[PDB]
């Protein structure tokens, strides 16, 4: 049936640092316009299964 429950951060504002855990989930800005928590166009999901 698939273990798609595992998820990995795909989109981040910038690079991480050694020893940083990332659990915060937010609409990711994929362009030059505000997102306002709506995943339509130029605003994507940070994590991917």
């Amino acid at each position: 049936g698939g273990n798609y429950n595992y998820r990995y951060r795909l989109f981040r504002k910038s690079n991480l640092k050694p020893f940083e855990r990332d659990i915060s989930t937010e609409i990711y800005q994929a362009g030059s316009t505000p997102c306002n928590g709506v995943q339509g166009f130029n605003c994507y999901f940070p994590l991917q299964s």
Partner: protein
């Protein structure tokens, strides 16, 4: 201009092109492009436009 079935094609190359005037110009209503970010056209440097 010409009609859509006979649309007019123009070549632009080997020049320094000002896109800020087009963006800020209030005469134009639609500047609507998303694969090309509307703000940094000057940054976008190409050939045979």
């Amino acid at each position: 201009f010409a009609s859509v079935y006979a649309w007019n094609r123009k070549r632009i190359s080997n020049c320094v092109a000002d896109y800020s005037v087009l963006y800020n110009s209030a005469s134009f209503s639609t500047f609507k492009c998303y694969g090309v970010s509307p703000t940094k056209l000057n940054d976008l440097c190409f050939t045979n436009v």
